[model samples]
Target: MVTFHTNHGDIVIKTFDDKAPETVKNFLDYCREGFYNNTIFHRVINGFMIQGGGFEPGMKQKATKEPIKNEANNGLKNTRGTLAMARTQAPHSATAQFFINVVDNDFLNFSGESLQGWGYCVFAEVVDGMDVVDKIKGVATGRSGMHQDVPKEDVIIESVTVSE
Candidate 1:
């Protein structure tokens, strides 16, 4: 389990190491390194997902480690409360950035090995503090320069704690 101490509240997540070994390991490595500390949820679309872990306040982008392969074929669905890797158009480009599904985003699930079908990898789920996620989703969002759907008030992740 991992606990994310955020300004809104704590969100506890249970990682699916067995299902997404590489993805989980990559996420855990970032958590252990405190790479997510003081990061803000830079992108938030109500009823879609809340994305973060790659930028600080004022839309400062954080440098991330190398990208990882897409593990979306691990039979995990992008259901509400599930945490999935955030990536660019390339399927295997996911790094430290991630998002929590605010609704059942079945459209983002893996379908096949093709370029367009390789979906976002879901490696974790919120086991607790989902209300915090709900609160975040409801927060007012506005455009921040090139980024859209950004929270007017920064929703910061103070720190992350990983445990056995």
Candidate 2:
């Protein structure tokens, strides 16, 4: 069981590496190495995505090491209760930011007739404490310009440590 001791609360993750190995490995690597500590929830859309795992307390954007290849071609969907990687305009620009789906976002996908059309790699699912995720999701938020949408309450994630 992989538990994330985040500021909001403890969240257990059911990793789907069997379906998206590379994406899961990369995200888990960051978790195990303490890369997500002190990151803020940069975007908090009420019914869509609640994002974090990057940036600092002051809303300052932190530079991610480098992006991984677009496993959007990987078999994963942006569905409720699933976790997805946040990326730049480039398909493969997913470095270290991620979001939880408060609602199913099927429109983000490219529904082609092959494995390459499966869309964003959903590395894990919330095994516990999704209520806390919803609590944060409903927080007041607005666009921050220069960055993704901002949470009005400043949901500071003090740290992210993996549980044994």
Candidate 3:
């Protein structure tokens, strides 16, 4: 299990090495590097999931070095408590954005890419701290008129250093 101490709260993720090896390795590398420092949750839809792992507090876009391929076919599901990668229109557009499921969401577990089949790769899950996720989910969200969907009060990640 890898525990990450965020300003909002600590998140405990137990990686599914048995299913998603590469996905787990890559995610841990990002975590160990302190890559998610001060990042904010850019998207949080109640009853769906709370997402963040990229972007600063002010909605300032961070510079991502590059993106990896979509591993949506890794055999992991977007069920409740699963940790899935967030991507753009393009399947491989996921840089750092990730979300914790508040409820079972099966539709997002496939790659929209005709060949890939499934859409998102679920690499891990919260072994603990479901309550923290629940707390974040309960926060009042207001749309940032400028960004349209982004919440005004940032769900600041603060940091994502791995603590085994």
Candidate 4:
């Protein structure tokens, strides 16, 4: 289990290590490196998802390592409370940023082998404190410069820690 300590509350998740080994390893590596500390859930869309892990409190983007392969082929669904890797339009461009689904986002699920058809990698699910996720998801959001779905107030992620 991994606990994401945030201003709203703690959102605990359990990784699908058996099913999405690489994705799990990537996320765990970020946790071990203290990469998610002080980051904000910059994007929060009610009935959609809350995305973070790659930006500071004021919407400053954090530098990330090289992109990783898209593991959407791992046969996971973008169900509510599930965690997924947030990438660009490119399928294999995922890095440290991730999101928690606030609702069943089936449209974000893998569909075909093409880049446009590939979708975000669902690597974990909420094991505890789904209410915390709801709290964050329900926060007010607006446009922050070029970015939309920006949380009006900071929802800082104090830290993320893995447990045995």
What overall lDDT goes with each candidate model?
Answer: 0.95, 0.76, 0.77, 0.92
Off by over 4 Å in 2: 113-118, 143-145
RMSD (Cα, Å) for all candidates, in order, is 0.6, 2.7, 2.2, 0.8
Model 3, 65-84: lDDT tens digits are 47767777777789988998
Q: Give per-residue lDDT, candidate 4, residue 164.
A: 96
Pairs of residues at least 3 apart in sequence or in different chains that clash in candidate 3: 38-158, 110-118, 110-119, 111-117, 111-118, 111-119
| Residue lDDT tens for model 4, 79-157 | 9999999999989899999999999999999988797789889999999999999999998889988999888899999
lDDT of 1 by residue, 1-164 (tens): 99999999999999999999999999999999999999999999999999999999998998999999999999899999999999999999999999999999999999998888998899999999999999999899998898999999999999999889
Which residue runs does candidate 1 get wrong by more than 4 Å?
Answer: none
| lDDT (10s digit) by residue, model 2, range 11-50 | 7778787776777888888877777877888888888888
Candidate 4 backbone collisions, by pair: none
Candidate order, lDDT descending: 1, 4, 3, 2
Best by TM-score: 1
TM-score of 2: 0.86
Worst 10 residues of 2 by lDDT: 110-119
lDDT of 4 at 16: 95
Query: Which candidate gets the maximum lDDT versus the true structure?
Result: 1
Prediction 3 TM-score vs. true: 0.87
